[PDB]
Design brief:
homotrimer; about 30 residues; little secondary structure; structural protein; Human collagen II; Triple-helix
Chain lengths: ~30, ~30, ~25
């Protein structure tokens, strides 16, 4: 038998990270 | 024919997630 | 002859969490 075939293709792009947290409350009025 | 080739590498990292929304109103 | 191409890689790592949003409006 021949040598092993070429390496497989690189996988697809990973998922986006989660949304960041809401900002802090505003300063006093 | 020889055996199947090795698996490919993991893909590129995903993008940064979206920014959070603006925060709440401050106090009176 | 050589064998066929290997399987595709898995999906990439998750991206980082997004940035915290801006401070809120004055009260």
């Amino acid at each position: 038998p021949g040598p092993p075939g070429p390496p497989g293709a690189r996988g697809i792009q990973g998922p986006q990270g989660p949304r960041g947290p809401p900002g802090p409350p505003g300063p006093p009025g």
